[PDB]
């Protein structure tokens, strides 16, 4: 059941070493190669299909990783 949430946390953990609003902000970067997998995993959590401070993506991922870890810990 919680396999999908588990795989995404692990991807975000790997590339640095609610679900709809994060994909909408992330599906703007195309010049970066590592985040491709992250974007593919997020669309499975967002029911409707998503198309097309000013801080970096490295900090947005850190924030998202925290929040996904808290969703897991709550079981949500």
């Amino acid at each position: 059941p919680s396999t999908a949430l588990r795989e995404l946390i692990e991807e975000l953990v790997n590339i640095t070493q609610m679900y709809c609003a994060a994909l909408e902000s992330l599906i703007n970067v195309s010049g970066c190669s590592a985040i491709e997998k992250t974007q593919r995993m997020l669309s499975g959590f967002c029911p409707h299909k998503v198309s097309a401070t000013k801080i970096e993506v490295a900090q947005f991922v850190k924030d998202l990783l925290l929040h996904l870890k808290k969703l897991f810990r709550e079981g949500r």
């Epitope: 059941p1 588990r6 946390i9 808290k70 810990r73 709550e74 079981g75």
Partner: antibody, heavy 121, light 107 residues
Framework: QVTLKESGPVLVKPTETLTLTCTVS??????????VGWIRQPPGKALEWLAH???????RYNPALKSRLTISKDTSKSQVVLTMTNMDPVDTATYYC?????????????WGQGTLVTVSS | EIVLTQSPATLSLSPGERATLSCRAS??????LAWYQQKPGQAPRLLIY???TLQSGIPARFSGSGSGTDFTLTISSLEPEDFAVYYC????????FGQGTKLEIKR
């Protein structure tokens, strides 16, 4: 080092309430990633998880016993309290508090010495 | 609701022998299973987490394997101090424990 000590052994008469205190040392109960759980073991039987609380007060409970269980933490006192109401003789067990081995996932790496709780008239 | 069945209930092996304990889930839980060792009058001791990752302090002769339903804790070559009760644990809620396999010294 990381140590966990359960409060002294208690005798509980049936239908009454069990209060256990887990005194913690070697880690702060407000540190990111910290989680303390309660696991019990009836004499000569398997382990059963009861509840665990995280540093940010996020709590998980055993689904079969959710209604009787209450877990809380107090960072300054370095303690984790478990309350179990309406005790049954079948609850007679060694009760363990153990720190979680992950900052999100659930497995227990440091364990307390355990405490015997007998429920009987 | 997923159940962890451990087989066999008791195991008789001599030191030096290769040990194989089994833990089986009634539904897929991926690679997320932990293992504990327990001696009499003592708290459980974590050996392995996430299927196969060896815990610090635990001697290399220990290992785990498997994903989905069929899991295994293996001990390459037994030592006298390795004989005790072994429990598996589901990482996922509601964190079910197995019934436990007792590893006995054959003599």
């Amino acid at each position: 080092q990381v140590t966990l000590k359960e409060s002294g052994p208690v005798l509980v008469k049936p239908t009454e309430t069990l209060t256990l205190t887990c005194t913690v040392s070697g880690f702060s109960l407000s540190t990111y990633g910290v989680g303390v759980g309660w696991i019990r073991q009836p004499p000569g039987k398997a382990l059963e998880w009861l509840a665990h609380i995280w540093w940010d007060d996020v709590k998980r409970y055993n689904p079969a016993l959710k209604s009787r269980l209450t877990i809380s933490k107090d960072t300054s006192k370095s303690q984790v309290v478990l309350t179990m109401t309406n005790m049954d003789p079948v609850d007679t067990a060694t009760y363990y508090c153990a720190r979680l081995g992950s900052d999100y996932d659930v497995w227990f790496d440091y364990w307390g010495q355990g405490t015997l709780v007998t429920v009987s008239s | 609701e997923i159940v962890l069945t451990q087989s066999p209930a008791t195991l008789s092996l001599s030191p030096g022998e290769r040990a194989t304990l089994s833990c089986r889930a009634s539904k897929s839980i991926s690679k997320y299973l932990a293992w504990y060792q327990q001696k009499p009058g003592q708290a459980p001791r974590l050996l392995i987490y996430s299927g196969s990752t060896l815990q610090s302090g635990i001697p290399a002769r220990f290992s785990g394997s498997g994903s989905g339903t069929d899991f295994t804790l293996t001990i390459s070559s037994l030592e006298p101090e390795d004989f005790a009760v072994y429990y598996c644990q589901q990482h996922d809620y509601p964190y079910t424990f197995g019934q436990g396999t007792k590893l006995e010294i054959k003599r």
